[PDB]
């Protein structure tokens, strides 16, 4: 890749600079280069990878929704709205495929600790979910099942190996609940998962330091925010 000649440590340093500069495409390219060095990622490095791509795909998702809404209104002016929505959609799919490619080659298979493996399987579920948001053809069901499968494996590991307040476990459950609500069209499963996750975390907060308490309650509030909208 175009980052092949740069040192791993320099790529990490520049990813952190890119984050400070709000240059998220650069940040993602630097972290992709770091992954392609072939070494496992530390906790901080995994978070840099995720933050970078989350910001890139987030811009694409927001743009796609704007264009999709305009397109739907135009169907209630020529091919241009569809063409441009398709252009953004294809770039979004490309980013998701890139992330999934990094996870499959070879981040997941080398991830043995729960904190790394759950993190990567959650990401796999997330990027299949972003693909599902735009999917319409004969593969939509298979994309949805790929998201479900990744989230389910992550859930199974997280429940065996992490406390119920673990922020990775909490963010996984949050995202899987949203998958249920609006991708799988299982709102009851979404509500049940969010409630059970919130309540089991509540009951474990007493074990935490002040700093860990803050980390866990931040994500618990996101579960509550969704439950308030859903019930």
């Amino acid at each position: 890749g175009a980052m092949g000649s740069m040192e791993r440590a320099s790529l990490i340093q520049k990813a952190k600079l890119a984050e400070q500069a709000e240059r998220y495409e650069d940040m993602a390219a630097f972290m992709k280069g770091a992954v392609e060095k072939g070494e496992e990622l530390s906790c901080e490095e995994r978070n840099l990878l995720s933050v970078a791509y989350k910001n890139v795909v987030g811009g694409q998702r927001a743009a796609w929704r704007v264009l999709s809404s305009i397109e739907q209104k135009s169907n209630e002016k020529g091919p241009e709205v569809r063409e441009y929505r398709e252009k953004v959609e294809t770039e979004l799919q490309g980013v998701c495929d890139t992330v999934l490619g990094l996870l499959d080659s070879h981040l997941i298979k080398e991830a043995g600790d729960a904190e790394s493996r759950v993190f990567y399987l959650k990401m796999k579920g997330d990027y299949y979910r972003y693909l599902a948001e735009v999917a319409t053809g004969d593969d939509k069901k298979r994309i949805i099942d790929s998201a479900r499968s990744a989230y389910q494996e992550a859930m199974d590991i997280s429940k065996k190996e992490m406390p119920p307040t673990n922020p990775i476990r909490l963010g996984l459950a949050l995202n899987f609940s949203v998958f249920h609500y609006e991708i799988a069209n299982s709102p009851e499963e979404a509500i049940s998962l969010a409630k059970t996750t919130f309540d089991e975390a509540m009951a474990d907060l007493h074990t935490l330091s002040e700093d860990s308490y803050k980390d866990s309650t931040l994500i618990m509030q996101l579960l509550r925010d969704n439950l308030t909208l859903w019930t």
Binding site: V51, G58, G59, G171, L174, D225
Partner: peptide, 12 residues
Amino acid sequence: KLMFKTEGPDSD
């Protein structure tokens, strides 16, 4: 579209 809360940067 109404977007629900998911983990990490709310970048969309």
